[model samples]
Target: MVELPFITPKPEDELLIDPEKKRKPGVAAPQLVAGDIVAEQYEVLGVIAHGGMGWIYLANDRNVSGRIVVLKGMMAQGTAEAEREFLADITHPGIVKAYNFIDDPRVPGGFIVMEYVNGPSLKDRCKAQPDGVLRVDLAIGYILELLPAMDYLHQRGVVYNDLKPENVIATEDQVKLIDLGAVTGIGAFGYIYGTKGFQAPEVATHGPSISSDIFTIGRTLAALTMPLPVEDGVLAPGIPSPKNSPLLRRHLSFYRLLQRATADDPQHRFRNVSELRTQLYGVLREILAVRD
Candidate 1:
């Protein structure tokens, strides 16, 4: 059995850590308290955020000169084991840099340490942009950089089950793909991962594919110009759409590519992520050349 974070037995809550530890619900369970430890040589700082998977903490990587890093605690069952396998498969510049994976029996649910990035998720920025319109030039430039990342993962035969604005992080000079918890081999499909709206229609039944990533990118691009829900279909009703989208008439080819990728049929989408990236970069360059 792998290591896990610790929890104090409480008078009112009964969430058990071990699957074998059986206790009927409706009874007061033990309260999970995150054990104090600077995970994997990183000094524990404080909590940054928490999600269904685990809590993210800002920590210092003492082994690496105390560089500030993000520690993602693995709270859910079997997450630590899955993480070790995932880390073994892929690593790339566009993806979040995973520094170390720790399966401490003393630490509740285990934890993962990754490079600390200071910017908000792409989801938040996309929502706050004027009328949902991000600067087109900046958007295009960022996508161009992201192409290699997508290509890297897809080429390795790794299927990234989740792709959305929240999973895409933006720092000053680069975009990083975070949360690899759902990454799997090319044909593995069991749970319904990824945000619903961003998922290709084919995902409702079959195994996830490289095309799914492309389809997600297309939908994301559309959101930059249109009022459609991005990554997730979450937002207040009646947000104004941007008037000057810079998605000029001549750029219809790129739109067509987006349409093709977002096609309901996986067979109809681009053969792979690299092909889609090439098409996007081609159109992006064509449009930029004219502007210059």
Candidate 2:
């Protein structure tokens, strides 16, 4: 695996417990250290990320010379198959690649080897911005890159249930969607995986749809440009008022776009991606002109 800098949560961080059992999250420490070989093929470098599900590690593929990959450990075998099926043939420049899945006897729930994206997450990038607020132009540019990818997934009959900044990577020239485990079929209902502030209110009952996906994009953009009050790292009950946000006050059209996109009623949200993109592009120009 390529030895690149990766973000790992602190050991003392609060772990998300199982809601049903109220038991402490069973996130085990990384079993494979640097130089350890798994399935006698890939070499584990170190832990890159850890969560309630399991650990994500950076590893090098011995069979593929100079090829670095990511090994994501799953907590359950049942959901593993579902995730694989969800991302089976998804190919997009804005989305990472899911190479293969392996069921090793040593690991608890097997591993999904994927393309290792060498970029900081959008959340990290936004945090690095001066004053914790991103430029309106740059924020719109990132969303432009993201909308097309969301459109692609929708075209393929999929709904990316999760579309938070943490799931998107920002690089020098591109923004890529990193996590695919939460993806599920557009209409099929089972378990809906999503981040708080970004998820539509109806998702728990009506299931994830294209409209819900659009709602998340709006929330993500809101988080990028404004300092939103979040409950547990998510936006509060409603979006911030335009008069309260300097960015929104200076750009009225952009404010309207956000209001419509994140409307409490999904029907009021933009249903067409192309139309939404066109409007957003126009708003960006208007904002730029005002800045000039």
Candidate 3:
């Protein structure tokens, strides 16, 4: 296991621009632009990602040897302030590091400074490649990197409300989970959080939790193994289709795990992040040996 950095924001100073942020009375979108300086240290380079919650910008930290970093800003909506405060508290391997928080009336909502990752988001990778399926070997390798981070977050009683291809970024030797659109422990009442297709059905009815991550991971792995525009119901497209076969014969165990995670009933799912990891690790070893 590689030792990855635990990057989180400092808690001493935090600012919130509003109790609720809106882009169009009801719509929400981050309004940061290039040349903007966040938290008086990082200079925004460009927008790398944008969503209903916030936008992620590629930036440079001039105060710290000009290190490149990612600035994630959340629209001040639905417990964002509380989530940002808690975000400062959670950090671990496979989790994106939040460097600082900045609130300016000028920027649509407020924003967070985090470790800049110059790699392909799982979504981008799947979309860019043929069939949208990353090699099973490569997909499992990155998911292994995420296990520790999920373990730490669940231990601290936090759930990564958003766990999709877009939220998972690949690094040199691992994967990092970024974005906390509907983090647990903080109420996101009335806010529709989660990437539609990747989100587990339970989340739409109940809320966020560690088990949701399990479901998301399973769905994600299934997605990584195929090439279909995510919203499409098919898994692996032209590859092997997942049916009601025993876990071992249908597809890769990782693929079965994905179905298990996406199971409509929460009761049938892995109990926690660790349980999911244990099963995933076993499957990973088996698949890797076959590949070798």
Candidate 4:
């Protein structure tokens, strides 16, 4: 059995973001508040998170006795494409499950009824860690746990364009990926949804592909294990000097992997998430040997 990171338990109230963060620019006034019913089934609980796209709400599915679901508001344009195409056949246990898409009055995009992941996100865990940076081994373990889902999506011709700690949930020995809002077909053209710094540089010119997806995996690893400076919600240019990053200095192999994964050229990344996973396991073995 491979060792994984310890996911700290969070109290129920952690579900709600602080009051000020509840609102984000470009997002209209919330259409549904606590106690409001949607589609005559889901009862709104509260706002869980607000993103560049829209608001994610925690709701109770009244139809099922003990079912709780996340009602996430998505932009109007992508609904047709997603409902008719993406994710309908997917049911990865490591990926948050989407049940239904229902219409809302003021929500121009409508909402996605998804699984309520009852666990702290990687972001929540990182903040509690010293200097907001996770240990090297722990960070890699989380990435390892998430590789299967990334591989699964890749196999199905989709790329998870936005990969970051904020979208990762750690629970019951599994790393679950939340927020499918940025996933796109491997070679799809048109507007791409990706976060800066973590997004592959080729995305704008080449569009999202297996290469770009691999780029995100590496960028996420760097974010988790280093004290990267942030500029406007994205990582600033410049890697932490190895001399200053003890974790990187001690594990040169891991540092090499990070460099390759986020290489400026797509050809430099691990051939695919499969190759990255295999290489990660090898790195894990080497790191563990030092513990003996």
lDDT for each of the candidates? 0.62, 0.78, 0.64, 0.81
- Total clashing pairs for each candidate: 12, 2, 6, 0
lDDT score, candidate 2:
0.78
Q: TM-score for every candidate vs. truth?
A: 0.71, 0.84, 0.73, 0.88
Q: Which residue pairs collide, candidate 2?
A: 1-59, 1-60
Q: Give the per-residue lDDT of model 1 (tens digit) for 22-71.
A: 55664332222334455347555555554556556666676767477766
User: What is the Cα-based TM-score of model 3?
Assistant: 0.73
> Which candidate model has the greater TM-score, 1 or 3?
3
| True lDDT of residue 145, candidate 3 | 76
- Which candidate number maximizes lDDT? 4
Off by over 4 Å in 1: 1-35, 38-41, 52-54, 73-89, 103-108, 229-250, 285-292
**Tens digit of per-residue lDDT, candidate 4, span 1-292:** 5666565566777776664564445566655688898889988888887776677788899878989899877643765665445665677989988777788786677887888887788888889987997877788889988988999999998888989999999986788898775677888877787888889898999889998888888888898888787888778754666788787788788888888888888888888888998899898788878755
RMSD of each: 11.1, 7.2, 8.2, 3.0
* CA lDDT, candidate 2, residue 148: 78
The TM-score that candidate 2 achieves is: 0.84
- Residue 65 accuracy (lDDT) in model 1: 72
The sequence of per-residue lDDT tens digits that candidate 2 reaches over residues 44-113 is: 7776777556767778888789987888875345865665866857999988888777766767888878
